[PDB]
Amino acid sequence: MEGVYFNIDNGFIEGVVRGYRNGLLSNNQYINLTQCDTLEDLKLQLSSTDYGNFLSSVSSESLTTSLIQEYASSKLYHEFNYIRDQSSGSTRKFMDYITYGYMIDNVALMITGTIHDRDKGEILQRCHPLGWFDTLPTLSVATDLESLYETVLVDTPLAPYFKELDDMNIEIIRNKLYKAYLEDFYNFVTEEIPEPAKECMQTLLGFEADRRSINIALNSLQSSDIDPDLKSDLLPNIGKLYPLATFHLAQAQDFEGVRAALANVYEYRGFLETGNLEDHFYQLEMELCRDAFTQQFAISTVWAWMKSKEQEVRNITWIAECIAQNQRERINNYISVY
Amino acid sequence: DEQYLRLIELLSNYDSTLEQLQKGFQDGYIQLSRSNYYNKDSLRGNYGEDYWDETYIGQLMATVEEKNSKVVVEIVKRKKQDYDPILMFGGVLSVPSSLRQSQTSFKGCIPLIAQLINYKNEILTLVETL
Amino acid sequence: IRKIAESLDANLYDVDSSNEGRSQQLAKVNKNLSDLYTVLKTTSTTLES
Amino acid sequence: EKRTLIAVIADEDTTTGLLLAGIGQITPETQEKNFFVYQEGKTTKEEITDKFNHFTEERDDIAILLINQHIAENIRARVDSFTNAFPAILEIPSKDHPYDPEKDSVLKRVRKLFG
């Protein structure tokens, strides 16, 4: 049973992460945030939550939405780092895998800044704290995929995922890295994560893969360099779209073909027939993360909390934008499930 | 003199162009913010300085000519380089549709910028006449 | 190599040659360090006072 | 006419928007950065005054200088001290600061005529 051996190594971790989940903003707290009309009022209301005095070091006039997002995300990062410092064994590997996606983000960010001739220090300061590795600053030396792989990426945990650069090439490399990483993380969950967390993490990683596959299928239509053979190299092989709808999207050239492929799955129909595609994926991710919190002895709670806080920072940043820019008609367009 | 009537007409057109420019910038800013929302494909959670290509030569240049005492400034679509700026931000696979909407709003701001500059210069020249 | 080393926050230096011709640079650095020691003592004595 | 480039003195979001509009970061041949990214609080008045002078005086190719109205208000004395009509200066709205007609120079100049 799940609770029999879980608490030997993860009882404290899971209790702390569930306290973090209790810290997620409820619907009433989001409504109170929405009622704010100034960013100082937003800071005041947000101090009545578990964010607390995270903006106390920021003066009233210096307060910007970018600062609010940066400090909320920093709080997220410190909480994740504390939870990972208490982890050992398979839980430590699980949270390292969680960091591997941010590692891929940092690699793509470094290469994007390098080909754009941005300041090296600025790119390093903008790198995600999660997903940092020691040889990350060395990625500025070259604009060649082979040169960076031999120079840096062969020693990183992203080395298994790689089996001059421009914006489209960096995009392709990043999406290939994501496909390989999602497949590897799915395999790791299948083989090394106990059953309730195994099923929850398989569902969550499959949803993430499906979101990426549908995005790639829909965004390759407006491009000509994305060959149908290249689309196969970008679509992950772990989701509910795999392998049927994944194969259908890897060959589609029109929006109707993509929509017909997505009518295959009962989980994602209506995503393309109404609303915004990204709103559907955000709502589904928050629904899945909310359901993952119904499992008590699952380490998938860490991933669910991480995604819920990322969505929470997105929501708070959107509310900050609909406070700063006026635009109070769109202030309620945030995903909330807690 | 009828020069004051033309000053009033120019002020009216200046007001209308300010209103259009402000609406365009508001749309672009809110859609850029809504692109910061929907940042799951972004490199760092934001569509901004992370993507700025400091080697980017734009798709637009300005043209300045003079007729009589009036000076006209126009922005034209000249001066693979000079690419679609959406590609600066991973615009092929890694941008939301809201970022494209924001780009549309700002690209609409550009003609309004040119018209506003021309109206401002025309008003200043007419005022110098009076 | 220079970009790689500087990416690791390594302070790169230009040595004149693989032979003893670098003795003149060493003397120049000794002069600079002597003047800098004088300045540093001048500042540090006031600060410590 | 040599003046053909568009210079920008804007904040981060306005710079992103103007880049999306297709305005270029550097001169196509000289490769000279004709953008200045103003950062609130961290950027002092002297930096933006220097960059305004740079885009308006030393550069002989800048045709349009787009500056956010709050940055222009930060140095309104220097901006109004500029009289040359060759580089056309336009104040543009910022993300969090809408265009305030109180700070419009054209409206005050029309005020000067008292009609």
UniProtKB/Swiss-Prot annotation, chain A:
Gene3D superfamilies referenced in this protein's UniProt entry, alphabetically: ATP synthase (C/AC39) subunit, domain 3 (1.10.132.50), V-type ATP synthase subunit C domain (1.20.1690.10)
A GO cellular-component term linked to this record: vacuolar proton-transporting V-type ATPase, V0 domain
Classification via Pfam families: vATP-synt_AC39
Any GO molecular function: proton-transporting ATPase activity, rotational mechanism
Gene Ontology terms describing biological process: endosomal lumen acidification; Golgi lumen acidification; proton transmembrane transport; vacuolar acidification; vacuolar transport
Modified sites of kind N-acetylmethionine: M1
Membrane topology: Peripheral membrane protein
Predominant place of localization: membrane
Localization per record: Vacuole membrane
Recorded superkingdom: Eukaryota
Entry-linked InterPro entries: ATPase_csu/dsu_sf, ATPase_V0-cplx_csu/dsu, ATPase_V0-cplx_dsu, V-type_ATPase_csu/dsu, V-type_ATPase_csu/dsu_dom_3
Keywords carried by this UniProt record: Acetylation, Hydrogen ion transport, Ion transport, Membrane, Transport, Vacuole
Record's keyword annotation contains Hydrolase: no
Note: Present with 1630 molecules/cell in log phase SD medium.
Known role: Subunit of the V0 complex of vacuolar(H+)-ATPase (V-ATPase), a multisubunit enzyme composed of a peripheral complex (V1) that hydrolyzes ATP and a membrane integral complex (V0) that translocates protons. V-ATPase is responsible for acidifying and maintaining the pH of intracellular compartments. This subunit is a non-integral membrane component of the membrane pore domain and is required for proper assembly of the V0 sector. Might be involved in the regulated assembly of V1 subunits onto the membrane sector or alternatively may prevent the passage of protons through V0 pores.
Family listed: Belongs to the V-ATPase V0D/AC39 subunit family.
Assembly description: V-ATPase is a heteromultimeric enzyme composed of a peripheral catalytic V1 complex (components A to H) attached to an integral membrane V0 proton pore complex (components: a, c, c', c'', d, e, f and VOA1).
Full protein name: V-type proton ATPase subunit d
Organism per entry: Saccharomyces cerevisiae (strain ATCC 204508 / S288c) (Baker's yeast)
Phylogenetic lineage: Eukaryota, Fungi, Dikarya, Ascomycota, Saccharomycotina
From Swiss-Prot, chain B:
GO CC terms in record: nucleus; Vma12-Vma22 assembly complex
Pfam families the record matches: Vma22_CCDC115
Secretion signal, residue range per the UniProt entry: none
Alphabetical keyword list: Acetylation
Superkingdom assignment: Eukaryota
InterPro entries in alphabetical order: Vma22/CCDC115
Gene Ontology biological process terms in this record: vacuolar acidification; vacuolar proton-transporting V-type ATPase complex assembly
Record bears the keyword Methyltransferase: no
Gene Ontology MF terms: unfolded protein binding
Cysteine-cysteine disulfides: none
Additional record remark: Present with 752 molecules/cell in log phase SD medium.
Entry function: Required for V-ATPase activity.
Protein name listed in UniProt: Vacuolar ATPase assembly protein VMA22
From Swiss-Prot, chain C:
Function of the protein: Subunit of the V0 complex of vacuolar(H+)-ATPase (V-ATPase), a multisubunit enzyme composed of a peripheral complex (V1) that hydrolyzes ATP and a membrane integral complex (V0) that translocates protons. V-ATPase is responsible for acidifying and maintaining the pH of intracellular compartments. Is present only in vacuolar V-ATPase complexes; enzymes containing this subunit have a 4-fold higher ratio of proton transport to ATP hydrolysis than complexes containing the Golgi/endosomal isoform and undergo reversible dissociation of V1 and V0 in response to glucose depletion.
Any further remark recorded for this protein: Present with 55714 molecules/cell in log phase SD medium.
Similarity comment: family membership: Belongs to the V-ATPase 116 kDa subunit family.
Range covered out of full length: 249 to 297 of 840
Posttranslational mods: Glycosylated.
Record gene name: VPH1
Taxonomic source organism: Saccharomyces cerevisiae (strain ATCC 204508 / S288c) (Baker's yeast)
Subunit structure: V-ATPase is a heteromultimeric enzyme composed of a peripheral catalytic V1 complex (components A to H) attached to an integral membrane V0 proton pore complex (components: a, c, c', c'', d, e, f and VOA1).
Name this protein carries in UniProt: V-type proton ATPase subunit a, vacuolar isoform
Subcellular location: Vacuole membrane
